[PDB]
């Protein structure tokens, strides 16, 4: 039946109805009205009700006024989408995607549902824009409006990535987050479609906390399940699986980490980076790439979550020192040591503080000495890290060719420190076997 | 063949009405309508090594009578093959990368992809002499040797509906590498062990 | 975006457009026969843009540089 297969593909690819029963069914598919009423409704009744809904939506938010001129127009009562050309259809698709990104925040409200019902019953968005409509209803997958949209969706018009929804169309129940997350770990296409929808919204600054929390939660659980799948024990397969995970993730996180204007999606990308650095055993250069981009990316609004994710990233590294620009922007951080004590009450900041002290000591600048002194007297490092940091400081003092005055002032303050850090510093002096009084009287004379 | 040809003949290139043979340090050019010898291009160098024509010569599509040769030094020299005249030279960026390993015309107009032995792939306007993209595409031990662009019109951008895909391979490996050239030129996949 | 090098031979070259059947399709009017090399290359560029239009990549961040660096995907 190759002819029946070719004709089945033609009938599935066809878009306009060609017999009266097909026109009546396609006109009967609605969100609000039952089918027995929605068959016998002209486009003046639908436009009156749904324009009352759009008047309420346009009085709520200001930015619906171009759609007042182009989508919800009295002339747009009459336009048939299947009679315009391909470029008119593509521009109408752009206008519809912009309205759906705009209306996704208020979609629990009956004005916004009336506006989406106008788009569905006039422009047939459930058939021609199934991707954007299904993606903008996906963060509301626990509501009866999503159940009704799932009821009126055509089956073969859904994209391949959203074909987990077929049992929930056969039995009209809302799909659970376990089903969405499990299909996100199995298919990279569904995770890429959700992340592409929310990043395309957040570039147009039409974000809302429901969408941001939705994407952050599903990418966090999807990266969790994806790491638990990618783990193999064989060396070359786990190398290739880490590379495939990074190639599937990298654009999304590389944009959502440095999206400065949207701190919610920035914090959600920090959450995904923290999961990726803790659970997945990655490499040191990948973790320095993540830290350098976070350091380039933070604001004042995400500074303390950025520092938490930075503590996790620096903790799960095998190398001991940080790569420059990380230490430069953490110099630019306002209250470093007090914030690190507030984090170290719950998060073990020791390797970050050790790498910070080493990367400051590797600078020959002398505007880092209050930060070095505070990080040493902080009680954040361990005894061995404090000892090797002070040894590197005295070695830098021996390597310098003023500078030595501030160096000796810092060294005499660190030697005359009070507690266990001062005990370990004087013990480090005793095991490097070099006298205090030489450089003491050399700087005092 | 000319009488004083004592070199192996590395590649052939037919365009216009001219067939062009890059031998090793020498280009012999015939006219194809009559299959007759026309002239001989002699690139020159100051050092002994830098004269060697590794890589090859390629034509750009809308460029009249011009071959683009790569040298053992980092230079890509444009040669007008009608009058046999060196018309421009374009220098390698960051000159630590030493030898032109290959070069291929993009589907964009007057943009050439030069691949150096030190690692970088550059794509450059060859009349503006201005670098469009710079990509650290190879290890210094594994130089990029063959590059080819997808002239389909789609295949990039994490959705598959955007163009700009380039495959590349080194001779020391057996894996090809696909780049999406859109944002900055990221990598999108590596097909591993395509051959032994 | 001024062109760096200029050819002196394309001024001198001339090409009949109505003679060849392949070059027949790239004339403007039903009068253009003999065309200099610069205008010939211009029509040839227009026809290449007709066959394959200019893609949108032909018109930094640490993680993006990490992704576009191919020394990171080693085995």
């Amino acid at each position: 039946s190759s002819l029946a297969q070719q004709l089945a593909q033609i009938a599935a690819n066809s878009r306009s109805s060609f017999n009266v029963k097909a026109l009546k069914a396609s006109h009967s598919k609605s969100l609000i009205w039952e089918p027995r009423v929605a068959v016998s409704q002209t486009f003046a009744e639908i436009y009156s009700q749904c324009y009352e809904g759009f008047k309420e939506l346009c009085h709520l938010d200001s930015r619906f006024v171009p759609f007042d001129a182009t989508l919800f127009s009295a002339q747009s009562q009459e336009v048939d989408r299947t009679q315009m050309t391909a470029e008119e259809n593509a521009a109408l698709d752009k206008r519809v995607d912009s309205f759906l990104h705009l209306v996704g925040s208020r979609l629990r409200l009956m004005p916004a549902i009336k506006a989406v019902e106008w788009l569905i019953r006039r422009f047939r968005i459930h058939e021609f824009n199934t991707g954007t409509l299904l993606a903008t209803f996906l963060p509301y997958h626990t509501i009866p409006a999503f159940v009704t949209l799932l009821s009126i969706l055509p089956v073969q018009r859904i994209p391949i990535e959203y074909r987990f929804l077929d049992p929930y169309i056969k039995s009209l129940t809302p799909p659970p987050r376990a089903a969405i997350v499990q299909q996100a770990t199995n298919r990279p296409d569904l995770l890429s479609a959700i992340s592409r929808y929310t990043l395309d919204s957040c570039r147009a600054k039409q974000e809302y906390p429901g969408l941001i929390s939705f994407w952050g939660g599903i990418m966090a659980e999807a990266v969790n399940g994806m790491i638990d799948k990618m783990r193999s024990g064989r060396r070359a397969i786990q190398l290739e699986n880490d590379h495939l995970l990074l190639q599937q993730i990298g654009p999304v996180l590389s944009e959502a980490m440095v999206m400065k204007d949207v701190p919610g999606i920035q914090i959600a990308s920090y959450m995904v980076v923290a999961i990726l650095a803790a659970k997945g055993s990655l490499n040191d250069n990948i973790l320095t790439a993540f830290m350098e981009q976070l350091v380039h990316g933070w604001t004042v609004d995400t500074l303390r979550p950025g520092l938490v994710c930075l503590t996790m990233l620096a903790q799960h590294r095998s190398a001991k020192q940080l790569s420059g620009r990380v230490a430069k922007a953490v110099i630019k951080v306002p209250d470093l040591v007090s914030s690190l004590r507030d984090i170290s009450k719950e998060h073990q900041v020791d390797k970050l503080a050790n790498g910070l002290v080493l990367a400051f000591v590797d600078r020959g600048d002398i505007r880092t000495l209050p930060v070095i002194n505070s990080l040493l007297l902080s009680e954040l490092l361990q005894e061995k890290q404090a000892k090797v940091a002070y040894k590197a400081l005295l070695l830098a003092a021996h390597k310098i060719d003023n500078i030595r005055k501030q160096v000796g002032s810092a060294l005499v303050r660190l030697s005359q420190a009070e507690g266990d850090v001062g005990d370990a510093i004087r013990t480090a002096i005793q095991e490097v076997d070099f006298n205090i009084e030489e450089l003491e009287l050399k700087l005092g004379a | 063949l000319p009488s004083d040809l004592d070199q192996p003949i590395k590649q052939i290139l037919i365009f216009g009405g001219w067939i062009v043979a890059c031998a090793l340090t020498r280009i012999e050019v015939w006219k194809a309508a009559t299959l007759e010898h026309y002239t001989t291009i002699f690139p020159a160098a100051s050092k002994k090594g830098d004269n060697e024509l590794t890589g090859g010569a390629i034509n750009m599509p809308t460029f009249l009578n011009k071959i683009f040769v790569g040298r053992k030094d980092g230079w890509v020299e444009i040669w007008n093959v009608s009058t046999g005249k060196l018309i421009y030279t374009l220098l390698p960026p960051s000159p630590d990368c030493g030898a032109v390993t290959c070069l291929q015309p993009t589907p964009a107009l007057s943009l050439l992809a030069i691949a150096y032995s030190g690692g970088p792939l550059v794509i450059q306007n060859v009349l503006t002499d201005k670098t469009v993209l710079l990509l650290e595409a190879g290890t210094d031990d594994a130089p990029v040797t063959s590059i080819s662009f997808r002239t389909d019109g789609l295949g990039a951008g994490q959705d598959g509906r955007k163009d700009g895909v380039m495959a590349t391979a080194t001779s020391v490996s057996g894996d090809v590498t696909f780049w999406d050239l859109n944002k900055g030129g990221r990598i999108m996949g590596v097909l591993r062990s395509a051959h032994n | 975006d001024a062109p760096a090098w200029e050819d002196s031979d394309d001024e001198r070259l001339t090409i009949s457009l109505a003679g060849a059947t392949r070059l027949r399709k790239l004339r403007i009017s039903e009068s253009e026969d003999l065309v200099s090399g610069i205008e010939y290359a211009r029509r040839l560029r227009q026809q290449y843009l007709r066959l394959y239009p200019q893609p949108d990549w032909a018109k930094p961040l640490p993680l993006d540089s990490f992704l576009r660096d191919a020394n990171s995907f080693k085995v």
Binding site: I160, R163 | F63 | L23, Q47, L51
Partner: peptide, 22 residues
């Protein structure tokens, strides 16, 4: 099932003939 590849057919593509760069 969806996501399965179809048969291979050579797509007709117009190429720039390079015999006219002369």
């Amino acid at each position: 099932p969806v996501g399965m590849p179809a048969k291979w057919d050579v797509k007709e593509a117009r190429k720039y003939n390079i015999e006219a760069d002369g």
